[PDB]
Design a protein around this ligand. Structure first.
Ligand SMILES: O=C(Cc1cc(F)cc(F)c1)Nc1cncc2ccccc12
Ligand SMILES: O=C(Cc1cc(F)cc(F)c1)Nc1cncc2ccccc12
Lengths: 306, 305
């Protein structure tokens, strides 16, 4: 019993964190096999940040301009290349702590653990979701660039995010490990803003199923809804549209609890209308949207309480 | 910017988790140096749990009855002893991954990271607080016993909790690493209940300072209060008393934000008496009490390990 915002154990990623320095700028790098991945803006001065020409800035650098430190050991850079917004520094030592890994690009609503780092050293681990507006509501200070997001389903680390920047609202933007930004963001100091964010409906439904599995049913009602009527209501509270894919994905939780997806949708519609009336669901007075259907099945028991 | 419920990096603890099997029961063990620590109830059948005599159950076991697996490697148990509610299995191999560590007993209100494990395999890491009623609101399934709680101070892991049981309300009970339970709990299948819990006042104040540091100020007001008047209001709302030690501990956050501790207490008093009025603080509609003043400073300063 219990339901917590749970991150993956971070050890497999901690053994990959290194410090990358180029001139006066120091940030984090991810050392996997003989390559260190880091944000390409490590080669920029603060003045270069408005309209940097990364190809032009990079051509002026040699391997010895990149200082990579792993623990108290300086790695030797033997090659460098840029792939989209990520810099790949070939080093002369394969990381002996390289876990089984993959690079995965995620979709909005997906969750992942972030290992926040500074100067190549891990500071903490927390759980995030890729918001519908492609930002993440992280906790990052200056020096956190290059910190990564990941999942570890089995013993394989799927790296899905590398931190690049903080937007004016205090939310964060980054790339996949191939250097492609999530969202319409660029690694430039030009005026950029997070679009209006919305609630991840499928995740709220998953979390309501988590509450039912853990023994709470106060919020259920005798009603059902069509998918279209649910979407017309939910959009009025800035909730993401629920697709038939989302309904299918919630099938297993629906079968385990005995509550049809559209019946749980009717419960959510009522919660949006009524609020919680002094009650909580899984220790929260707000509807939680940073647990996916996959997270709920992984965290919760396979036996519903009642 | 941003403020998240953040756990310590778990790698140093992951390298210590092992699987301990005794008969039909499998749970987690903590392998440090040449000793594996685990809940003593690993030696019990369901019948034994009703009223166990752990000394009597243990005397019937030999070293080979304990199967300890560190990954895909079977460790050989060369001795066994009980310390309070923890079983200590001496093994022939010192854990090469043993970090610098200490065993510390924490006080209610203190937070720690839990590395939830099943079959000696870490599954998740989360941050929680030792409640004033000595339970933890964890997330644990069957097989999670022996999962540990810890903090990191510099390069040293301070182990403070070992998971033993789940109470009927779904909250959790465990011991320090010396096997002393937190709270009035016993490792036996007998009627036990979590006592009425209270809110960790100093932690709510720390989180309000975190909200201010993050640009959330709507709850600030021109008012101050005395410590005694604040504690009268705290008692009324099932909040823990705020001591002068708590006020001193919040000094640095008070100096950084310009909001004196008693000035923040008057914000907290108004929030308790009136609610949030449809507003949120750091994305929460409830007052969060599972961040200590140290956690707030650490997260807002970027301390690494
Ligand atoms: O955003 C940047 C630097 C940057 C600026 C830019 F215009 C484009 C970039 F790709 C990167 N750094 C930070 C990242 N995360 C959190 C932070 C918090 C405070 C101060 C800086 C933080
Ligand atoms: O509570 C126990 C076993 C136990 C029973 C007892 F009566 C006394 C004990 F010291 C230990 N194990 C569990 C721990 N955490 C979570 C669980 C969730 C579901 C089922 C069991 C869970």
């Amino acid at each position: 019993s219990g339901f917590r915002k749970m991150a993956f154990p971070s050890g497999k990623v901690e053994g990959c964190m290194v410090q990358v320095t180029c001139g006066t700028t120091t940030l984090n790098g991810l050392w996997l096999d003989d390559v260190v991945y880091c944000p390409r803006h490590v080669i920029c001065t603060s003045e270069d940040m408005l309209n940097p020409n990364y190809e032009d800035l990079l051509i002026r650098k040699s391997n010895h301009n990149f200082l990579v430190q792993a623990g108290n050991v300086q790695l030797r850079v033997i090659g460098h290349s840029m792939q989209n917004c990520v810099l790949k520094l070939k080093v002369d030592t394969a990381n002996p702590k390289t876990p089984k890994y993959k690079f995965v690009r995620i979709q909005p609503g997906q969750t992942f653990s972030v290992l926040a780092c500074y100067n190549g050293s891990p500071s903490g681990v927390y759980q995030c979701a890729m918001r519908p507006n492609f930002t993440i509501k992280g906790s990052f200070l200056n020096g956190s660039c290059g910190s990564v997001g990941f999942n570890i389903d089995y013993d394989c680390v799927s790296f899905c995010y590398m931190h690049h920047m903080e937007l004016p609202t205090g939310v964060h933007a980054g790339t996949d490990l191939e250097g492609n930004f999530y969202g319409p963001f660029v690694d430039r100091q030009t005026a950029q803003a997070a679009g209006t964010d919305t609630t991840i409906t499928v995740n709220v439904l998953a979390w309501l199923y988590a509450a039912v599995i853990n023994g709470d049913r106060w919020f259920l009602n005798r009603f059902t809804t069509t998918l279209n009527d649910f979407n017309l209501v939910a959009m009025k509270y800035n909730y993401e549209p629920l697709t038939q894919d989302h309904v299918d994905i919630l099938g297993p939780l629906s079968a385990q609890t005995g509550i049809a997806v559209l019946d749980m949708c009717a419960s959510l519609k009522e919660l949006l209308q009524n609020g919680m009336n002094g009650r909580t669901i899984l220790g929260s007075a707000l509807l939680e949207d940073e647990f996916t259907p996959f997270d709920v099945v992984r965290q919760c028991s396979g036996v519903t309480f009642q």
